[PDB]
Amino acid sequence: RSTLVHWFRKGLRLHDNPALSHIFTAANAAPGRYFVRPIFILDPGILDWMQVGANRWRFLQQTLEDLDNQLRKLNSRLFVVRGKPAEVFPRIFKSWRVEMLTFETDIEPYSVTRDAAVQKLAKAEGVRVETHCSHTIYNPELVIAKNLGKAPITYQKFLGIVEQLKVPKVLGVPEKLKNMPTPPKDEVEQKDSAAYDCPTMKQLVKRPEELGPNKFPGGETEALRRMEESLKDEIWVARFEKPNTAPNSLEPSTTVLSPYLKFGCLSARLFNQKLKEIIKRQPKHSQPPVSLIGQLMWREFYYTVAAAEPNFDRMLGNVYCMQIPWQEHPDHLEAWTHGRTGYPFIDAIMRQLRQEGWIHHLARHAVACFLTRGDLWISWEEGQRVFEQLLLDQDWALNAGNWMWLSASAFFHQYFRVYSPVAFGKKTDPQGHYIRKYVPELSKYPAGCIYEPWKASLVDQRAYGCVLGTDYPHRIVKHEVVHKENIKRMGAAYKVNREV
Numbered sequence: 001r002s003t004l005v006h007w008f009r010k011g012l013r014l015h016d017n018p019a020l021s022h023i024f025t026a027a028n029a030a031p032g033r034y035f036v037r038p039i040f041i042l043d044p045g046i047l048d049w050m051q052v053g054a055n056r057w058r059f060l061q062q063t064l065e066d067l068d069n070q071l072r073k074l075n076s077r078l079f080v081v082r083g084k085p086a087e088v089f090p091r092i093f094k095s096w097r098v099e100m101l102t103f104e105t106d107i108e109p110y111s112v113t114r115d116a117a118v119q120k121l122a123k124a125e126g127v128r129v130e131t132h133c134s135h136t137i138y139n140p141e142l143v144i145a146k147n148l149g150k151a152p153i154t155y156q157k158f159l160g161i162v163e164q165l166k167v168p169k170v171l172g173v174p175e176k177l178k179n180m181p182t183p184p185k186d187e188v189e190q191k192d193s194a195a196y197d198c199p200t201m202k203q204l205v206k207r208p209e210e211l212g213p214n215k216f217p218g219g220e221t222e223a224l225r226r227m228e229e230s231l232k233d234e235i236w237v238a239r240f241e242k243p244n245t246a247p248n249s250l251e252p253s254t255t256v257l258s259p260y261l262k263f264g265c266l267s268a269r270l271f272n273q274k275l276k277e278i279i280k281r282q283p284k285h286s287q288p289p290v291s292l293i294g295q296l297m298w299r300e301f302y303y304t305v306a307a308a309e310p311n312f313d314r315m316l317g318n319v320y321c322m323q324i325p326w327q328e329h330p331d332h333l334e335a336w337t338h339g340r341t342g343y344p345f346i347d348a349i350m351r352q353l354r355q356e357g358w359i360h361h362l363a364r365h366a367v368a369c370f371l372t373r374g375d376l377w378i379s380w381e382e383g384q385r386v387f388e389q390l391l392l393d394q395d396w397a398l399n400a401g402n403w404m405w406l407s408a409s410a411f412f413h414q415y416f417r418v419y420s421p422v423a424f425g426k427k428t429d430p431q432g433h434y435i436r437k438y439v440p441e442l443s444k445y446p447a448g449c450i451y452e453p454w455k456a457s458l459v460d461q462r463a464y465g466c467v468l469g470t471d472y473p474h475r476i477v478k479h480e481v482v483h484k485e486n487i488k489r490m491g492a493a494y495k496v497n498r499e500v
C-alpha cells in the first residue's frame with residue numbers, strides 16, 4: 001500500500017480546504033489503495049523565527065484538539081509529528097510510502113523557503129506535491145501579475161485589480177473516509193503509541209502563569225460558531241463601518257474573527273461569500289474600505305504587498321519602507337511593553353493585549369502611534385515584536401503592514417495627524433469604563449481625570465487610593481512636548497528619503 005498526506009500549517013480546518021479535500025476524494029475514489037495521514041508538524045524551527053506567547057500557544061493547542069476531533073468524525077485523525085520538516089519528511093516519505101503531499105501555500109518568507117526545501121525533497125523521492133492557494137481570497141501572485149509585476153501600493157488600486165478577478169469556488173467539508181484501516185504503526189508510533197497525539201496544554205504552554213481569560217477558544221468549530229453569531233445581525237453586518245466601531249467598549253465592537261482567519265480555522269473565502277449573501281439581501285450597506293468585506297480586502301491587500309517583499313517585517317531592505325532614524329530607549333520600550341507608560345488609555349490597551357491577546361484595531365492604532373511616531377520614537381519593529389508575542393491573531397503580513405502604516409513608514413504619509421493618548425479614548429468611553437477594567441488601580445478616579453490622573457491633586461490621589469509614582473507610574477513622556485518634536489523629526493526623515 002501507499003500513503004496520502006495532507007500537511008496543515010495554516011488552513012487548520014476541514015471546510016473550504018481544497019488541499020485536504022483532494023486527498024480525501026482521492027482515497028475514496030480508490031478504496032483499499034491508500035492510507036491517509038493528515039499531519040501537523042510541531043516545528044522547533046519557528047520558535048527561533050517567531051516569539052509565541054502563552055495565549056497563542058493555548059489557542060493553537062485548542063486548535064489542534066478541535067482539528068483532531070473534526071477529523072475523527074471523518075474516520076481519520078490528526079497526526080502531530082514533532083521535529084524539523086527537513087528531518088521529518090525524508091523519514092515519513094520512506095517510512096510511509098508517501099505517494100502524494102498536499103498543503104495550502106503561504107507567502108511568509110520562512111514558509112516559502114521551508115516549502116521549496118520540501119518540494120525539492122518530494123521531487124527526489126518521486127512524491128507528488130499539489131499545493132492550493134486558499135488562505136487568501138485572491139492569489140497575490142495573480143494580483144501582482146495583473147498589475148504588471150508590482151504590487152499595488154494603495155487599497156483603491158488593489159480593489160481595481162481584484163474586481164476583475166475570479167472569485168474561487170468555496171468547498172465544503174470532505175466526504176467521510178469510506179472503509180479505511182488505521183495506518184499501521186510506523187517506527188516511531190511503535191516505540192510510543194501516543195507520539196503523534198495532539199499536545200496537551202502542559203506540553204505546549206511552558207508558562208501557564210501568563211494565560212489570561214479563556215475568551216476565544218481556538219479551532220474551526222468555534223470559528224464557524226463565532227462567524228454564525230456575527231452574521232446573525234444582518235443590519236450590523238450590512239451597515240458596518242470599521243472607523244465607527246469603539247476601541248474601548250468592554251465587549252469587542254468588531255467580529256474577533258482575526259485569530260481564526262490567522263490560523264485558517266475560518267476560510268476567508270467562506271467568510272467573504274457569507275458576507276456577499278448578506279449584502280445582496282441588504283440594499284442599504286457600507287462599501288469598502290469601511291465595510292466588513294472591506295476589512296477582508298485589507299487582509300488581501302497586505303498579503304499582496306507582503307508577498308512581493310521578503311523583508312516586509314523590517315525597515316532595512318524593504319522597498320516600501322521609509323528609512324527613519326528611530327531611537328533606542330529600552331526603558332520607554334519596557335514601560336510601553338508592560339503598560340506602565342503612565343497614560344491610562346495606553347496602559348489599559350497594553351494590559352488588555354497582554355491578558356487577553358486581542359485588542360480592537362483602533363486600540364492598536366493608539367498604542368502603535370504612541371510607541372513610534374507619536375510619542376516614544378521607537379522603531380515599529382519593536383512594536384511588531386511585542387504584538388507578535390501577544391496577539392492571538394499575529395500575522396506576519398498584517399502585523400508588519402499595519403505597523404508600517406501606523407508609523408507613517410509606508411502606505412500612510414500624513415504623519416502630522418497624531419492620536420492623543422488622552423483625548424482619543426474619550427470620544428467612545430467618556431466614563432473611562434475600559435480604563436477602570438484594565439487599570440483597576442485607577443478605578444476610584446472620577447471621569448473628569450481618569451484619563452489624566454496627574455490632574456488630580458495629591459490629596460485626591462490619596463483619597464482615590466492610587467498615588468502617582470507609587471501605585472501608578474508618572475507619564476514616561478509629556479505627549480504635548482514629544483509629539484511636536486516627533487513631527488519635526490518625521491518631517492526631516494521624509495525629506496532625506498525624498499532625496500534618494
Ligand SMILES: Cc1cc2nc3c(=O)[nH]c(=O)nc-3n(C[C@H](O)[C@H](O)[C@H](O)COP(=O)(O)OP(=O)(O)OC[C@H]3O[C@@H](n4cnc5c(N)ncnc54)[C@H](O)[C@@H]3O)c2cc1C
Nearest residue numbers: 254255256257258295298299361364393394395398399402
Ligand atoms: C499595529 C497593528 C497591528 C496589527 N496586527 C495584526 C495582526 O498581527 N493580525 C491581524 O490579523 N490583524 C492585525 N491588525 C489589523 C486589525 O487591527 C485586526 O485585523 C483587527 O483588529 C482584528 O479584529 P477583528 O477580527 O474584530 O476585525 P474586523 O473589523 O471584524 O475585520 C474582520 C477581519 O478582516 C481583517 N482585517 C480587519 N482589519 C484589518 C486590517 N487593518 N488589516 C488587515 N486585515 C484586517 C482581519 O482578518 C479581521 O479578522 C493590526 C493592526 C494594527 C494597527
